Amino acid sequence: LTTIWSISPTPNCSIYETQDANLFLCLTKNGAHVLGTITIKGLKGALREMHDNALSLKLPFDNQGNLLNCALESSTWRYQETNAVASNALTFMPNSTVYPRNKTAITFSVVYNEINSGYAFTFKWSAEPGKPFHPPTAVFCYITEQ
Amino acid sequence: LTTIWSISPTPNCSIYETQDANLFLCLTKNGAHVLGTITIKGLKGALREMHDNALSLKLPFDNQGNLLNCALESSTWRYQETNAVASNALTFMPNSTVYPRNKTAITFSVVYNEINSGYAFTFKWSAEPGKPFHPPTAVFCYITEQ
Amino acid sequence: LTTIWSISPTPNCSIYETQDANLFLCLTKNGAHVLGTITIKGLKGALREMHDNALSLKLPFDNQGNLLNCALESSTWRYQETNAVASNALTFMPNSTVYPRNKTAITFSVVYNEINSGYAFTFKWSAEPGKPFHPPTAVFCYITEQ
């Protein structure tokens, strides 16, 4: 399996209130690299008229590569090729030697494994107060766990 | 098949006059992502001494992923691995859900599916008047049709 | 084989003195493209308190894709999947038609095939005098030899 994504026609992400955003994250594995693209669109509430000037999204995983409860609707986190939920995706996780847990690591950033157990992505975007939250798509690349 | 490219030792692109440029576009598919690199070199005519300060190149495709008549010599648009023409390359086309047709979406840009039928890439570069057109190589990444 | 890397827990690179740095270079091949990430960390000597404001690293290869004697410890240059040394990696070499030998092609740059025989990567980073050498990770993409 090469691809995990969160494609959804309907809102699948909850930042300030339930299902107020659409998150499209796509990971494709090529050996030890994953290529990621991420697009987040604010749809309801304060995400249409921002008060803060930055927003973060954390996707936590267990030590086997399963998505844990978080802002993303887990039923939308699927292997694209089979359309099964993206369970046990250890070889898509950020490598814990290259990115040890809790190591230090419009603007965008991604930090890997800022979590006490398992794995994580922490995304951060700047935001413009008074405007809808809808940052440009970002592309990133990281080394995976074996 | 992983790779489509337009490699050519001789001019294979017509911007202002016949065969006045060399276009090297290389697409490699990794699951739902394509990684693209594009290099265009002006060789003859106004491309050696630009009058305008921007230039675009559109590559249109039918709904099956075949390149339609355009500035690129179609005989150079080939699957690298077999050296056959890159016919029916649907799974290299920009995804029409992620990039709906006609949706809004040195400088470089790529816009996907700005076309009424099928698929497209529209590339745009800035140019420096009075100088040859030969922008730096650009790398881009997009989500493919399934 | 998809992946070559230089992962090492201990110093594996010699810039000013023996084993004064850690080089982590990871190449993954997807058809005609390689995606590369490179991280270099200065560990000893002047690399902890720079005098110059730029540093280069050249990785030379023979015409068969074997790493030749250079600043990187060759025993750490391995196919990730088999953990064998990365011998005869011709299809990871920068394409000699796209990047002809000796053709012209914090800051980072990579130049391909600046060498009289075989293949090469030449990396260059800026550095801040008085500070340790530890530039941000860089990601790059190139076309491979067939």
Swiss-Prot record, chains A, B, C:
Positions of transmembrane segments: none
Subcellular location field: Virion; Host nucleus
Superkingdom classification of source: Viruses
Induction profile: Expressed in the late phase of the viral replicative cycle.
Subunit structure as annotated in this protein's UniProt entry: Homotrimer. Interacts with host receptor CXCAR. Interacts (via N-terminal tail region) with pentons.
Note: All late proteins expressed from the major late promoter are produced by alternative splicing and alternative polyadenylation of the same gene giving rise to non-overlapping ORFs. A leader sequence is present in the N-terminus of all these mRNAs and is recognized by the viral shutoff protein to provide expression although conventional translation via ribosome scanning from the cap has been shut off in the host cell.
Function: Forms spikes that protrude from each vertex of the icosahedral capsid. Interacts with host receptor CXCAR to provide virion initial attachment to target cell. Fiber proteins are shed during virus entry, when virus is still at the cell surface.
Annotated domain remarks: The tail region anchors the fiber to penton base capsomers, whereas the shaft, built from several repeated motifs, allows the knob to protrude from the virion.
Family: Belongs to the adenoviridae fiber family.
Protein name per the record: Fiber protein 2
Species of origin: Human adenovirus F serotype 41 (HAdV-41)
